[PDB]
Amino acid sequence: TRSPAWAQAVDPSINLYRMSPTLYRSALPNAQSVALLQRLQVKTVVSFIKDDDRAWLGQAPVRVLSLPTHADRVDDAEVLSVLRQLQAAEREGPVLMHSKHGNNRTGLFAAMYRIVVQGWDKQAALEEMQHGGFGDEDDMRDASAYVRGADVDGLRLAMANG
């Protein structure tokens, strides 16, 4: 992230980056991350894996939105459902979305947010996904594969409908 438009680093230990005052991406957080998440005033923690975040969250007054998935199985239908739930969660306050390593599944949905919601073109979002410090491209084969060949116009159109 040297382009100021890319996600800014907050906590590289858990791969935590800021996309906006109301949206954060990261890897799997722990008990030590709770304090920081409350500074950022996170109200919703979206997870793309099965690990019950309520375990490390403790009695933190945040909503848990579990959306467990597999990057090699995601399609346009799942993406739209996630983007809608992310947007709705943003209206309630700042949101953290995460996975195991926060560069494949997270990198996929992050890039799609850039394209569908913020109106970035496909390659711009890709350049932030593969380069930006989230990981190396070997970790993102599934994510990279989907972003390419994804009908961005059909996604934006279907998004504008609902």
Side-chain angles (χ1 to χ4, degrees):
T1 301
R2 144 153 181 78
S3 172
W6 291 4
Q8 298 302 317
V10 181
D11 192 345
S13 66
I14 61 171
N15 208 15
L16 175 65
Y17 287 73
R18 176 188 297 103
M19 290 176 65
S20 74
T22 57
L23 185 60
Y24 293 81
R25 58 173 295 175
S26 74
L28 173 60
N30 49 44
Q32 280 74 14
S33 304
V34 175
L36 171 57
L37 296 190
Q38 291 182 330
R39 174 172 75 90
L40 306 172
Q41 304 181 49
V42 170
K43 269 77 178 185
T44 303
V45 181
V46 185
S47 180
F48 304 117
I49 56 184
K50 294 167 186 168
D51 303 25
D52 184 25
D53 292 342
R54 190 57 72 185
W56 59 263
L57 271 172
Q59 230 266 350
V62 302
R63 175 200 173 189
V64 172
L65 177 54
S66 188
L67 300 170
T69 184
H70 314 279
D72 66 330
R73 292 291 189 83
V74 304
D75 44 25
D76 294 342
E78 181 187 334
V79 164
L80 293 176
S81 180
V82 170
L83 290 180
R84 282 191 179 93
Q85 291 180 77
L86 285 180
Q87 286 180 124
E90 279 190 277
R91 302 187 181 94
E92 306 296 332
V95 183
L96 172 63
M97 60 175 184
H98 76 86
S99 54
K100 182 64 176 180
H101 295 114
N103 51 29
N104 197 30
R105 278 169 289 203
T106 300
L108 191 150
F109 291 119
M112 291 300 100
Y113 187 97
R114 295 291 196 189
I115 293 179
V116 180
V117 183
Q118 294 191 250
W120 293 16
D121 51 50
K122 185 172 298 186
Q123 245 290 322
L126 271 176
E127 202 195 334
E128 185 197 35
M129 194 184 66
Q130 303 167 343
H131 327 286
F134 311 114
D136 40 49
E137 319 208 17
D138 163 64
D139 295 327
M140 312 176 188
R141 282 187 297 255
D142 289 339
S144 295
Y146 172 77
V147 181
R148 314 167 195 145
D151 193 329
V152 300
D153 290 325
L155 286 172
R156 288 167 176 165
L157 178 61
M159 183 68 65
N161 198 278

